[PDB]
């Protein structure tokens, strides 16, 4: 029952260069038909906020509401297809409003409009 | 400012991968916006594979071997997408037409649950 908007812990390693690696939270951005039936999911990496900057492909999430070590940001320029086996525990899920912010950042990141 | 633009098809090394993720050295199409393609250390791409049966998959976009010089008739998989460091990009094979890129945008929207 993996759903779009869920935040899972996942192992992104190994990676190269400026790709985001390590074991970190990721948010599921794949549509729910694929999340239901497919061997893979598509995710965006989350990282620990390290400076207040306005980046159109970034979406901030608060440490408290969602249960997080820190105030974090979702990087919609770091996205990948993972085998579902990579998904460890499910940490949380994002609100509808937050997912709207995410959809937006995603559109920007992928050069899509509407 | 790298000449990397959205729609370009590059050869790239996806390996190593796990399970059903697409690995290997294959063609990929650049789906990132062109500001990021210009300035950023990474690009976002969708994997291309050889077409192994004609099937109607909403997240798949077929591309002909002739118009894009290609070993085979191929399909772009919009459910297999990832951010690569630009160093992973080998030679630039080709670029896709505007119409084809529209098909891609649509498949992408479907794949990511956007409308």
Q: Do A112 and B110 touch (CB under 8 A)?
A: no
Tokens of B71: 């070993």
Please confirm whether the linkage preceding B50 is cis (ω < 30° from 0).
no
Instruction: Give the residue carrying structure tokens 């920007």.
Output: A108
Q: Which residue range(s) make up the domain with B102?
A: 1-115
Are residues A16 and B80, on separate chains, in Cβ contact within 8 Å?
no
Q: Is B103 on the interface with A (CB under 8 A)?
A: no
Q: Which among A79, A86, A112 is the nearest to B109, CB-wise?
A: A112
Among B32, B34, B33, smallest CA distance to B81 is for: B32
Under 8 Å between Cβ of A66 and B67: no
What's the CA gap between B114 and A103, in Å, rounded?
Answer: 7
Of B79, B83, B86, the CB nearest to A34: B79
Q: How many CB atoms lie within 10 A of CB A63?
A: 13
- Residue A4: both structure tokens together: 């779009």
Interchain CB contact of B3 with A (< 8 Å):
no
DSSP letter, residue B65: T
Minimal C-alpha gap between B82 and chain A (Å) = 4
Bridge partners of residue B12, in order along the sequence: B26, B89
> How far apart, in Å, do the first and last CA atoms of chain A sit?
30
Experimental technique for the deposited model: X-ray
Token duo for residue A59: 């979406």
Handedness of CA A87, A91, A93, A94 (dihedral sign): negative
**Contact residues, B window 57-76, toward A, CB-based 8 Å cutoff:** 59
Residue B111 neighbours by CB under 8 Å, 6+ apart: A30, A31, A34, A42, B58, B59, B78, B79, B81
Cis amide prior to B92 (ω within 30 degrees): no
The data reach a resolution, in angstroms, of: 2.7
- Domain containing residue B71: CATH number: 2.30.30.110
B88–A16 CB contact, under 8 Å: yes
Count of structural domains, chain A: 1
The answer to whether B103 and B115 are in contact (CB under 8 A) is: no
**Residue A35 backbone dihedrals phi, psi, to 5 degrees:** -60, -35
Q: Which tokens go with B18?
A: 């796990």
């Amino acid at each position: 029952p993996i759903r779009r908007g869920d935040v899972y812990l996942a192992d992104l390693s190994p990676v190269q260069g400026s790709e985001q690696g390590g074991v970190r939270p990721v948010v599921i951005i794949q549509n729910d038909t694929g999340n239901k039936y497919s061997p893979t999911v598509i995710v965006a990496a989350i990282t620990g906020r390290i400076n207040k900057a306005k980046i159109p492909t970034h979406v901030e999430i608060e440490k408290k509401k969602y249960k997080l070590d820190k105030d974090s940001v979702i990087l919609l320029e770091q996205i990948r297809t993972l085998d579902k086996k990579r998904l460890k525990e499910k940490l949380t899920y994002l609100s509808d409003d937050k997912m709207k912010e995410v959809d937006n950042a995603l559109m920007i990141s992928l050069g899509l409009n509407a």
